[PDB]
């Protein structure tokens, strides 16, 4: 099956573009990464950095995860991200998203050997 690390890359990594392409970015992207297949995932963040830069966050600032676990890490530098947020009019299977571009610190949870991101926790 798809590993947790690979699931993180599918859900959250878009190194192809420097920022949110367009107003239509989230609609195209949430569908193509299979985030609208079983339901409309209501919120999702994409990170526009190289994979190496994001994997490096697992050795940056250790912070508590929202769930109380302690394996979360906050990036020291801000990163280019896009938040995708379901619109009020969105109804499965025709999911619809607002696309918002931002530059924020990311918080990810890391596990494994090698120690890599498996969960996007928050942006701050």
UniProtKB/Swiss-Prot annotation:
Principal localisation: secreted
Effect of residue 119 to A: Loss of activity
EC top class named in words: lyase
GO terms assigned for molecular function: lyase activity; nucleic acid binding; ribonuclease A activity; RNA nuclease activity
Keyword Signal belongs to the record: yes
Reactions performed catalytically: an [RNA] containing cytidine + H2O = an [RNA]-3'-cytidine-3'-phosphate + a 5'-hydroxy-ribonucleotide-3'-[RNA]; an [RNA] containing uridine + H2O = an [RNA]-3'-uridine-3'-phosphate + a 5'-hydroxy-ribonucleotide-3'-[RNA]
Keywords from the UniProt entry: Disulfide bond, Endonuclease, Glycation, Glycoprotein, Hydrolase, Lyase, Nuclease, Secreted, Signal
Entry's localization field: Secreted
Tissue specificity statement from the Swiss-Prot or TrEMBL entry: Pancreas.
Keyword Lyase tagged: yes
Superkingdom, natural source: Eukaryota
Sites where a glycan is attached: 1, 7, 34, 37, 41
Cysteine disulfide partners in this protein: 26-84, 40-95, 58-110, 65-72
EC number in record: 4.6.1.18
Residue numbers annotated as active site: 12 (proton acceptor), 119 (proton donor)
GO cellular component: extracellular region
An example Gene Ontology biological process: defense response to Gram-positive bacterium
Chain sites annotated for binding substrate: 7, 10, 41-45, 66, 85
Subunit-structure text: Interacts with and forms tight 1:1 complexes with RNH1. Dimerization of two such complexes may occur. Interaction with RNH1 inhibits this protein. Monomer.
Family to which this protein belongs: Belongs to the pancreatic ribonuclease family.
Its biological purpose: Endonuclease that catalyzes the cleavage of RNA on the 3' side of pyrimidine nucleotides. Acts on single-stranded and double-stranded RNA.
Protein name as annotated: Ribonuclease pancreatic
Shown segment, full-protein numbering: 27 to 150 of 150
């Amino acid at each position: 099956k798809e590993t947790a690390a690979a699931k993180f890359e599918r859900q959250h990594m878009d190194s192809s573009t420097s920022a949110a392409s367009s107003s239509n970015y989230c609609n195209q992207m949430m569908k193509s990464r299979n985030l609208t297949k079983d339901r409309c995932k209501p919120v999702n963040t994409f990170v526009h950095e190289s994979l190496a830069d994001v994997q490096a966050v697992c050795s940056q600032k250790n912070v508590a995860c929202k769930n109380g676990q302690t394996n979360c890490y906050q990036s020291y530098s801000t990163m280019s991200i896009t938040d995708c947020r379901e619109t009020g009019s969105s109804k499965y299977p025709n999911c619809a998203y607002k696309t918002t571009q931002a530059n924020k610190h990311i918080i990810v949870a890391c596990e494994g050997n090698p120690y890599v991101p498996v969960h996007f926790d928050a942006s701050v």
